[model samples]
Target chain A: MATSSEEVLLIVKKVRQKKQDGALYLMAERIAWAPEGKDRFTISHMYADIKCQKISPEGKAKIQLQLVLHAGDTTNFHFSNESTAVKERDAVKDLLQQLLPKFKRKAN
Target chain B: EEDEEEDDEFEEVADDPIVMVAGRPFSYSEVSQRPELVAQMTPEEKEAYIAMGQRMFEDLFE
Candidate 1:
C-alpha cells in the first residue's frame, strides 16, 4: 500500500508529464481546510481532468482528458512548487480551463 | 489462566489507534498524551470519512 505522501508525489508527477505532452491540463481550486494533528491543517484534496482534443481543418475538434483531479488536499506550498516546476502561469491556467469544459458538459 | 490474563491486558489499549512513525508502532498512550491535532478540514475530508464509516452515524453525512 502506498503512503499518502507517495500517492501525492505520483499524482504530481503525472500532472507534470501531462503538461509536457501538451495533452495535459490542471486546475487549482482551494477548498476549506480541516484541522488535524495538533498544529497541522489539512486542505481539501485537489482534482483535475485531462482530456484529449483534436483540432479540425475548420477549427472544430474532439476533446477529452485522460487525467482528472477529483478531491484531494494538496498543500499550497506543493501547488506553488508545481507551478514553479512548469515555469509559467499559462501552464497552470491551461489546467484550470479544463474544469470549465467538464462543468459545461454536466450542466448540459 | 495465563492466556486469559494476556487477553485482559490487550483489552486495555485495544480501542486506541496504533501510532506508526517511520513504520514502527509507537506506544498507544504516548499518542493520546499529545496535544490534539488542529485543522480546517475540507468538505471532501468530512464526506470521505463519513463514507468510510469512521465518523459517528449521527453526524450528518456531508
Candidate 2:
C-alpha cells in the first residue's frame, strides 16, 4: 500500500498537470483535516478551472486559474504526520516545476 | 416603522459587502471548540487567517 505522503504527492502531481495545460483553476475551497494525535499537520485541497485570457494586443493566450490548497486533514502526530506548511508549498512548487513547460511563450 | 427603517438600511448595505480583517485570535484547538465562529468570518478576516497560516508555515522553514 502507498504511504500517506505518496497519496498526497500523487494528488499534487495531478493538479500540476492540469496547471500545465493552461487549465488551472483558482484556489477557492478547501477541506480541513483533523487527525487525532500529538503532532499537528493540516492539509488543504484546492484546484481551479482553466480559462484563456488575452495576453497582449496581438491576441496572445494566457492561462487564468483559480486554485486553493486548502486543508485536507487536521493535526495528527502518530497516525499520519505530514510536513509543515512550507514543506507543502515546496512540494507544490516542485510539482509546478515538473508540469509547467520550460519554454516561455512569446507574444504574437 | 423603526423595524422597517432598519430593514431598509440593511438592504442598502447588502449591496456593499463588509470587509473583515482579523487574525485567528485563538489557536485551532481553541476555535475547534467553537466551530460556529468559522461560519461568521468576513472576507478580510478570512484573508488574515490564511495569511497567518502562511506566515506560520514560513516561520517553521526558517
Candidate 3:
C-alpha cells in the first residue's frame, strides 16, 4: 500500500489465487492481493469496473470468492484463512455490493 | 518526544500500517468486520482493478 492518504480498509490474511499464497486488501478505490512474501500487488482490481462477485458454495468444502469485472473475466480468491472463512466471504460481498453501486455504469 | 532532530528520509513505520480508529493500532486480523469504513478511498487505482475483475466476473456469466 502507498504512504499516500489511501487507507487499507480491510484485509484477508490468507488467500490462494491460482495456487499462490497471498493477502487481500480492500481500499477505497480498488481491491488488491499480494503474494505472502512480497509487498507488490500481483492481483489488483478497481471498484468502478468490477461487475460483481460470487462466494463459495454453501455446502462446499472450501471457502472462496470469484471477483468478476466489466472486462469479462473472473479471478477466484480462495479464502484459506485459519479462522472462519465463511463470514469473511459475505463481508466482502456486502461491501462490494454497496461500493459497486456508486460506480455502476449506465444501464444499456 | 525528543530524539535526533534530523533523520534519513527512507525510514518509515511499516509501509503505512493498517490501523482502525482506536489507539490499539489495529493490524490485519484474520476475520471480517464492518465495512462501513470503506466508503473513504482514493482513485489512484481507479482503472487497474477494472481489467482484472472484468476477466474474473465475466467468466462466470459465460
Candidate 4:
C-alpha cells in the first residue's frame, strides 16, 4: 500500500502494448500498474531502481515510454494517445530529477 | 535409425534459443540481431521491434 505521504502524481489510463492493457500510476515514491478494474497492482517498482527512461513517439498519435532498471531489466509502457503521453512523460521526468538527487545524497 | 531421428528432433528443440514476446514466441538470436537493422526499418517495422523489446523485457523480469 502507498503511504499517506506518497502523493499520486499522475494516472495514465488505457495503456496498451501488443496484447497488454493496464492503468499506470506514478506516485511520489514508486510507479505501479494494474489491469483495468483491478484493485491490486500487477507490477510495481521503486523510483530509485530506475536507471534511465526514454520516451518516443510510436506513430502520429501514440507514444512509448521505456524504463531501464539498474538490475538490467527493461520495460516499455505505451500510451494510446499523444497528448497524455507527453504530459505524463514530462511529469515523470521532472519527478525523477527531483527525487533521484535526494536518493543519491542519502546513499552517500 | 528411427530412434536416432527422434533424438535429433529433441536436441534441436533443446538447442533453440526461444523467447516469448507479447504471447508470441520469437527466436532470441533474431531479436538480438535487430538493433543493427533499425536504420533500415520502416515505421511499422520499428514499431514491431519496439513492441518485441518491450515484451522481451517483461518476459525477462516481470
lDDT of each: 0.25, 0.26, 0.55, 0.53
Superposed Cα deviation of residue B13, candidate 4 (Å): 40
Candidate 2 has a TM-score of 0.20
Better of 2 and 3 by TM-score: 3
Q: In candidate 2, which residue ranges exceed 4 Å CA deviation?
A: A1-108, B1-29
Stronger candidate by TM-score (1 vs 4): 4
Evaluating just chain A, the predictions reach TM-scores of 0.22, 0.23, 0.85, 0.75
The count of backbone overlaps in candidate 1 is: 32
Worst 10 residues of 1 chain A by lDDT: A54-63
Question: Which candidate model has the greater lDDT, 3 or 4?
Answer: 3
A108: Cα error in model 3, Å: 8.7
lDDT of 2 at A74: 17
**Best-fitting candidate, scored by DockQ:** 3
Please tell me which predicted candidate would have the highest TM-score against the true structure.
3
Docking quality (DockQ) of candidate 3: 0.02
Which regions of candidate 1 deviate over 4 angstroms?
Answer: A1-41, A45-89, A104-108, B1-62
Model 1, range B1-62, lDDT digits (tens) per residue?
11111111111111122343334443233333542311222355334333333322222243
> For candidate 3, lDDT tens digit of each residue in A1-108?
767667566787677776577877777778888889778899888776776666565554566677667788767777677575756655665566545544544221
Q: List candidate 4 stretches off by more than 4 Å.
A: A1-5, A57-61, A104-108, B1-62
Candidate 1 iRMSD in angstroms: 26.3
Candidate 3 or 1, higher DockQ: 3
Query: Candidate 1: what is its chain A TM-score?
Result: 0.22
Residue A34 accuracy (lDDT) in model 2: 28
Candidate 1 lands at a TM-score of 0.18
